[PDB]
Amino acid sequence: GQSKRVDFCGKGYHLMSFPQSAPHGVVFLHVTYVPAQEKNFTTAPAICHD
């Protein structure tokens, strides 16, 4: 599945995971989306048209 629980399936936004076998346990490879370059913009809650 695709969990929405924060930091449950790794840091960042979860996309998918792949298990791997290990002696006496399991290892998960968690693939996540992480925001990178960003810019600062002016903002507003609403637009006044007519």
């Binding site: 629980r5 924060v6 930091d7 449950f8």
Partner: protein
């Protein structure tokens, strides 16, 4: 010495049982604390962040 040793061994065995009982109870309680701490950590991630 040979008489004192009998009386002392009785006390040592009993004293060891008191300490073993203590340790066992602390381990059980600690497991319960661990579960609470794990819950708290989950809430921090999902409720706070």
């Amino acid at each position: 010495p040979p008489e004192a040793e009998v009386q002392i061994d009785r006390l040592i065995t009993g004293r060891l049982q008191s300490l073993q009982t203590y340790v066992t109870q602390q381990l059980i309680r600690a497991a319960e604390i661990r579960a609470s701490a794990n819950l708290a950590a989950t809430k921090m991630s999902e409720c706070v962040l």
